[PDB]
Amino acid sequence: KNYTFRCLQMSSFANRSWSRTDSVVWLGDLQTHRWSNDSATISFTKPWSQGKLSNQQWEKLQHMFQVYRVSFTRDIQELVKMDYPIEIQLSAGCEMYNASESFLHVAFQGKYVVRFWGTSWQTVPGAPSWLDLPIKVLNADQGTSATVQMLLNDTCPLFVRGLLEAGKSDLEKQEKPVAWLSSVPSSAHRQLVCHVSGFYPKPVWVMWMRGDQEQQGTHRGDFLPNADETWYLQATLDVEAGEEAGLACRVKHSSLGGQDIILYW
C-alpha cells in the first residue's frame, strides 16, 4: 500500500490587523495532527503522532514551525503592503512507495501558483506576474533553500517511515460495513438506495444485482466520512414499477472475510 503524507496549511488574511493560520496533517485518510491558530503547540490526534522522533527532537521541530508560522504571517502582510481578503494554502508532504517523492505546493485565492521543485521555488505557468520578483528574492536565500530541501528530501520520508511503524494497528484496521436499503419515487419509477456505512479501509465494492447479473444502472455516490474514522457510501438504482422484485444489493469489503453482505429488496 502507498501512503500519501500531507501537511495542509490554511492561512486567511482579512486586513492588516487580522489573520489566522490553521494546519492539519493526514497520513492517507487518517488525521495525525492539528494545529490551531490559538494554540502555541501542535496537537496529536493519535497515540502514535510523534512517530519515532524523541521528545527533544519533537520539541525543537515544534519550535521551528512556531517561528515559521509567525514569520510566514509577517512576510505575507508585508507582501500585501508592497487586496484583502487573501487566502493562502500550502500542501506539503510525501508519497511513499522503499522509495518516495516529496511535494510542496502553494495556492493563492484557491488557485495553484507556486511549487518548490529540486532546489528552488518556481511559479507555475499562468500564475500572476507580480509573483516573479518576490519568488526571485526568496530563491536568493540559500539557507532557506537548503532548509526546504532537507525537509522534503530527508525529514519527510524519514518521519513517515516512523509513523507507518508506530501507527500500524490503526493504519491496518478493518471495520465492517453495515448496509441497509431504502427507496424514493423518481418519475411517473423508483430510486432504490443501498447505504453502506462504517467500513474501513476505503476500498469497497457495492452493486445492485439480479441473481449473478450486475445491474449497470448502479450509481455509486462519493465516499463520505463518518466522524469515527470510517466511511459511508450509497449506491442507487432507478427501477421501473414492478421490476423491483428480485433485486439485491451486494457489498464486498476486506473486513468481511470473503462473505459478502447481500440485502434483498
Binding site: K60, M64, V67, Y68, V70, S71, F72, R74, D75, E78, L79, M82, L133, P134, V137, L138, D141, G143, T144, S145, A146, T147, V148, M150, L151, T155
Partner: peptide, 18 residues
C-alpha cells in the same frame, strides 16, 4: 520580500543539518 521566512530558514538550517 519574505524577510522573516528568510531569517527563519537561515536560523533553522543547522538544526536540520545535524
Amino acid at each position: 520580500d519574505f524577510h522573516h521566512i528568510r531569517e527563519w530558514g537561515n536560523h533553522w538550517k543547522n538544526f536540520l543539518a545535524v
